[PDB]
């Protein structure tokens, strides 16, 4: 209601002629409204005798119709802006720790990271997001560069070398780190992605432009009919009054279709937001209803994200039970999801409830980044866990030996798309812990479903070729393309757009923003930030590509509703034609008066009722449009048969009886 | 009456079908770039001598070749008509035509209209007629057939860039399609009583004293080519009612079959080269349904005829006012619909003389765009535009993507479709409105009331659609009408054939794809009905006010 009044005010603002020529049929009814108002004015106050009241009546009706159509457009735009604000409205407050005496310093000034310029020095510590791009100059940590690659493995930034360029937005995990802001706030990575998305603009769906062609064609036809209808009738005798001529023009041109367009749009918007998937317009809904190829991100889209422990792989005769017990008791104190995941896996795959307790006298040995391995010392034991090379160094330094089959298992776990954590107890490697990703949850079966729908499936990732191949095969996609920088995303999506196939997209990071924006239908998840939500028309907080199957089904149904009502408009228009023609032709040959079928009261009443029915079509078609008709699966031939039968018969019959009952109203009321 | 008529239309269609079938096979052979049975060394020597060594053409080159041939023919025929007091074969020393009349005649013949605003018995001179008009009647028909050949190739060639050799198509289409069949029909007319001699106008004294001066030139030749090519431009003023041109009832029947021979066969051939004859049947059924409805309407209307004669005294009451006695009111009505829907233009009875409905149906068949078995070449691609539009709207209303015969219909092709389909009624309405709005064009009328308006409307409808028939009461020899109709015919023809080549070029690059859920069978009675609906509704919506104000107002009066 409040939104509706807000939309009404906006529509009357949108009256402005500069914006009227966006749609052709609308500007036509606009200029028609203008002509009839000018005629009404001069006639009522000037040198043109005639019935001023008829002209004022008709002119008001035309103006009214423009108002209603613009109001439907304003309602659509208002609902879209409302949902956009409700979904993209959240509190934000980036903060940075500006330093003085930048060796280490201790003057942490909580300056908003946006206010940082090049050359300024910053401090970041465990958990604090990297305020802006730059370089490292002291301290070494493990940044969570998941928004750049898509991976979740922490990468070591270590103040001098080739690992020295942090990125704004990525999170820091291990320990403190001082940064040297080496980019301006206007030329940051986020601004590069913003420039890309801003530079890209979406185009109209083929199904939209096709309808537009048909509308403009009908417009030309009726315009030529009436414009030339003036002198024909002139020759015979009295010329048809220009007022009835322009009135008939606007009554005959397919005005109804624009309002119906917006109506179907808001209909699909309501259904879509009702399916736990918010959108930006019914345009995106139909584009979802005609998806040809999906562009997926392995990390954060298909998988839930933040991969945790998975399966154990011991060495030769090392008593796998011992490996699981060691891993459980070692990763106990940890709090990161990977340690708790190791604990849960071991505890639910074996019986070791007795040993877990935090009251025992053990000095927890946390991660250090010098030796690069965590662990514990419970009783006469030194359990440690970490990278393969870190434990290799530890063993070789402790006068032990590093078996080779442990390294074989490590290479295997790397080939399976997982980071292997070797475990040691003294000087004997116990095995490996494979931190595989989370699960697809039935995506292979649903990709088979997609294949049944003849919709291509594509992957996008920035991982190694072998890892990409393994995870892609496990996903069931047709093919893959790895090391795909955002520019590569756009390159691929545009080279495929060259073929004309509607592309679907989804992804979470800042790196996937440009691809999301360009795609005609792209969904988003909660893992992504404003960079995600702001790029792409669609959104899905659930992060389950399954829903794409459902949303193309829903899009199918929306297209069906559009088609049916597209039959109604056509039928209604042509019925108006055959129902109004003779009633208008009543000035030169009375025989044509005898040709009337509905027997309207008079030509004035006829045209009046006609334009009235025009505006009525708009308003009374809004509800049935936003309601939506239930669809059942059927074949194109029978689909056409049924569509024609129901909507065609309804439309072709409506304007006749409608104008007849409005004529009954006219006669009994006595307006004229 | 109803028994003599049902039989007349029945045997007509049956015979036409049979002839169109083996013809269809032959045209299919010609559209697989395959040489006809015995003409493959003759063809080699002839093409080498003419310097037409085979090398394909994209759509731009094909289009430019056709237009260049047509402009060369136009220049030649224009200058020939202007200077016919220097050329031989002129027994009656007739003078050279005017500039306006020569311009209108040149433009009309070059664009397959054959609109006549003169009198051939006292204007042309056995040489403009022989080497000026018949040559055109061949080249014009060949140009139309060339374009539809290129279109059919566009549909069958998958993911290519060639559209055939224009010149080889013209040379094959003229030398082995038109000339022999035409020569055969020419000797046939000669046998029935038609005329073929280069004698001077004979002197004749009647059984009483009145002095007749019979005109006698080469008629059979022109008759055969003007009917087989659907040109419609006749040697005498009454183009086909004259006895020397249409002497016996048999000759009339051969004329109607010849009026349809090529277009019906092109429908069959299109149905064959694509390998699926169901497509051809779908097309033929669509056109034939409209045809039967129209013939029934016109026959019924005229058999009722003028009710005033009965009160004045006539024994029977059939509108036999502008119809020859060799044939009845039935054949006259049938031929009216046949020449009007087939875009030929030849009339065997004065169309102005029909009753109101008899004037409404033919005019209305012309206005829709000459798609019911239309002109040789022009009609089939007219009904390709309408078929493409029909799948465009069917797919649009059902909610799928439009694909036809495997190809994928893009927004670009649709744009061109709309463009062409509108270029014809725009000329019709604009020209008729301009004429009615000017005292000059208004003064040419010969009938008061709304029928007078029907005259102007019909004239421009024939011009824009290249039909070539006319209500004939309109005195359209003044310069105003010559230039107006010249402009209409020229723009109608070429405005409607350029977008066809554009669409052909686009579809030649498209590749055919496998069935889907957006592929609705275009063969069967659901597409047949969909298409009839498309054509009829488009036409009705575009012309109901004119029709209401013209023949209908005359009728109800």
């Amino acid at each position: 209601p409040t939104l509706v009044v807000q939309a009404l005010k906006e529509a009357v603002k949108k009256l402005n002629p500069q914006a009227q020529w966006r749609n052709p049929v609308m500007f036509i009814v606009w200029i028609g409204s203008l002509l009839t108002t000018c005629i009404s004015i001069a006639m009522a106050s000037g040198a043109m005798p005639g019935n001023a009241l008829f002209s004022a009546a008709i002119s008001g009706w035309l103006w009214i119709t423009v108002l209603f159509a613009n109001f439907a457009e304003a309602l659509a735009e208002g609902r879209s802006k409302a949902q956009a604000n409700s979904l993209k409205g959240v509190k934000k407050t980036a903060f940075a720790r500006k330093l003085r005496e930048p060796k280490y310093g201790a003057a942490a000034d909580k300056v908003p990271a946006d206010q940082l310029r090049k050359g300024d020095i910053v401090l970041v510590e465990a958990g604090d997001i990297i305020p802006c791009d730059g370089e490292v100059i002291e301290g070494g940590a493990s940044v969570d560069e998941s928004a750049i690659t898509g991976e979740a493995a922490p990468v070591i930034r270590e103040s001098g070398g080739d690992f020295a360029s942090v990125t704004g937005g990525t999170r820091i995990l291990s320990d403190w780190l001082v940064i040297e802001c080496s980019v301006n706030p206007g030329e940051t990575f986020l601004d590069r992605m913003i420039a890309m998305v801003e530079g890209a603009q979406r185009r109209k769906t083929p199904n939209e432009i096709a309808l537009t062609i048909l509308l403009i064609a009908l417009t030309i036809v009726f315009l030529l009919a009436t414009a030339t209808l003036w002198p024909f009738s002139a020759w015979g005798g009295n010329a048809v009054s220009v007022t009835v001529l322009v009135a008939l023009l606007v009554c005959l041109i397919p005005t109804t279709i624009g309002g119906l367009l917006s109506a179907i749009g808001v209909a699909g918007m309501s259904r879509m937001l009702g399916a736990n998937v918010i959108a930006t317009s019914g345009r995106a809904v139909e584009a979802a209803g005609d998806v040809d190829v999906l562009l997926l991100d392995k990390t954060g889209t298909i998988t839930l994200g933040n991969r945790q422990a998975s399966e154990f792989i011991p060495a030769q005769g090392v008593d796998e039970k011992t490996l699981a017990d060691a891993a459980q008791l070692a990763s106990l104190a940890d709090e990161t999801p990977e340690g708790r995941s190791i604990v849960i896996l071991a505890k639910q795959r074996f019986n070791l409830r007795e040993r877990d307790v935090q009251s025992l006298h053990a000095t927890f040995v946390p991660f250090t980044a010098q030796s690069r391995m965590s662990g514990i010392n419970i009783d006469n034991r030194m359990i440690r866990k970490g990278s393969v090379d870190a434990i290799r160094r530890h063993v070789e330094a402790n006068g032990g030996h590093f078996p080779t089959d442990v390294d074989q298992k490590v290479d295997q776990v790397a080939r399976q798309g997982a980071t292997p954590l070797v475990v040691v107890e003294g000087s004997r490697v116990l095995g490996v812990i494979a931190l595989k990703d989370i699960v697809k949850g039935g995506i292979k079966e649903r990709f088979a479903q997609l294949r049944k729908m003849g919709i291509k499936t594509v992957m996008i990732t920035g991982d190694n070729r072998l890892t990409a191949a393994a995870i892609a095969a496990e996903a069931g996609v047709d093919d893959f393309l790895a090391e795909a920088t955002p520019e590569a995303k756009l390159a691929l999506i545009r080279q495929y757009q060259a073929e004309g196939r509607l592309v679907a997209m989804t992804g979470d990071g800042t790196n996937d923003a440009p691809a999301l924006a360009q795609a005609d239908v792209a969904v988003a998840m909660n893992s992504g930030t404003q960079a995600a939500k702001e790029a792409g028309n669609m959104v899905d907080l659930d992060s389950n590509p399954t829903k794409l199957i459902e949303v193309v089904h829903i899009g199918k149904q929306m297209l069906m509703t559009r088609g049916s009502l597209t039959t109604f408009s056509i039928a209604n228009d042509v019925a108006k034609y055959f129902a109004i023609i003779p009633a208008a032709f009543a000035a030169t040959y009375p025989q044509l008066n005898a040709l009337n079928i509905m027997c309207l009261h008079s030509p004035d009443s006829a045209i009046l009722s006609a334009v009235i029915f025009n505006a009525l079509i708009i308003v009374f078609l809004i509800p049935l449009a936003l309601k939506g008709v239930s669809y059942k699966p059927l074949t194109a031939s029978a689909m056409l048969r049924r569509n024609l039968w129901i909507y065609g018969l309804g439309g072709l019959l409506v304007p006749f009886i409608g104008i007849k009952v409005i004529d009954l109203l006219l006669t009994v009321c006595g307006l004229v | 009456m109803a028994a003599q008529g049902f039989l007349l239309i029945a045997t007509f269609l049956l015979v036409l079908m049979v002839l169109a079938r083996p013809l269809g096979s032959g045209l299919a052979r010609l559209i697989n770039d395959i040489p006809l049975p015995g003409t493959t060394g003759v063809e080699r020597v002839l093409f080498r001598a003419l310097g037409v060594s085979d090398r394909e053409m994209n759509w731009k080159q094909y289009l430019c070749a056709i237009l260049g041939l047509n402009m060369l023919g136009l220049a030649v025929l224009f200058f020939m008509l202007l200077g016919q007091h220097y050329l031989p074969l002129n027994p009656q020393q007739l003078p050279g035509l005017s500039w306006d009349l020569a311009l209108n005649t040149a433009v009309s013949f070059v664009t397959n209209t054959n609109w006549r605003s003169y009198s051939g018995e006292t204007t042309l001179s056995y040489f403009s007629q022989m080497a000026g008009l018949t040559v055109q009647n061949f080249l014009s028909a060949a140009s139309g057939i060339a374009v539809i050949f290129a279109l059919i190739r566009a549909f069958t060639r998958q993911s290519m860039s060639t559209l055939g050799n224009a010149w080889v198509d013209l040379l094959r289409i003229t030398l082995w399609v038109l000339v022999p069949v035409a020569l055969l029909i020419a000797l046939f007319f000669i046998q029935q009583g038609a005329l073929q001699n280069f004698l001077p106008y004979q002197a004749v004294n009647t059984v009483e004293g009145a002095q007749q001066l019979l005109p006698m030139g080469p008629v059979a030749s022109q008759e055969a080519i003007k009917m087989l090519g659907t040109n419609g431009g006749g040697f005498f003023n009454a183009n086909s009612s004259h006895p020397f041109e249409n002497p016996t009832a048999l000759t009339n029947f051969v004329q109607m079959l010849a009026i349809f021979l090529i277009p019906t066969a092109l429908c069959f051939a299109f149905g064959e080269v694509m390998g699926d004859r169901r497509q051809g049947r779908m097309l033929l059924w669509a056109m034939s349904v409209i045809f039967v409805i129209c013939v029934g309407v016109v026959m019924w209307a005229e058999v009722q005829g003028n009710p005033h004669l009965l009160a004045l005294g006539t024994d029977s009451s059939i509108n036999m006012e502008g119809k020859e006695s060799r044939f009845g009111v039935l054949v006259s009505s049938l031929f009216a619909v046949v020449t009007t829907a087939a875009s030929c233009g030849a009339v065997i009875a004065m169309h102005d003389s029909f009753t109101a409905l008899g004037g409404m149906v033919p005019m209305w068949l012309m206005q829709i765009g000459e798609v019911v078995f239309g002109g040789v070449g022009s009609g089939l691609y007219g009904m390709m535009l309408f078929v493409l539009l029909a799948v465009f709207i069917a797919g649009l209303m059902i909610g799928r993507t439009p694909e036809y015969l495997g190809k994928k219909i893009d927004v670009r092709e649709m744009k061109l479709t709309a463009l062409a389909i509108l270029v014809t009624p725009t000329l019709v309405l604009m020209g008729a409105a301009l004429a009615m709005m000017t005292d000059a064009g208004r003064s040419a009328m010969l009938n008061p009331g709304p029928h007078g308006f029907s005259e102007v409307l019909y004239a421009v409808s024939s011009a824009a659609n290249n039909n070539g028939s006319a209500f004939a009461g309109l005195s359209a020899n003044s310069p105003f009408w010559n230039c107006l109709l010249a402009f209409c015919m020229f723009v109608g023809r070429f405005g409607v054939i350029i977008p066809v080549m554009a669409i052909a070029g686009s579809l030649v690059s498209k590749k055919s794809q496998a069935a889907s859920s957006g592929t609705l069978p275009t063969h069967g009675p659901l597409f047949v009905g969909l298409l009839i609906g498309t054509v009829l509704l488009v036409g009705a919506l575009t012309f109901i006010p004119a029709l209401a104000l013209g023949p209908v107002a005359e009728y109800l009066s």
């Binding site: 966006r22 052709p24 036509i28 200029i31 185009r203 109209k204 432009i209 537009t212 062609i213 403009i216 064609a217 417009t219 030309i220 315009l223 030529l224 414009a227 003036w230 220009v242 | 927004v411 744009k415 709309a418 463009l419 725009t426």
Partner: peptide, 26 residues
């Protein structure tokens, strides 16, 4: 008359506008 010529002028330029809009995908 003045009104007639002005009307036809308006209709002509309007047809130019509509055909332009048709050939476009604005």
């Amino acid at each position: 008359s003045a009104g007639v010529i002005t009307g036809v002028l308006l209709v002509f330029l309007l047809l130019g506008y509509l055909v332009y809009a048709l050939i476009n995908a604005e």
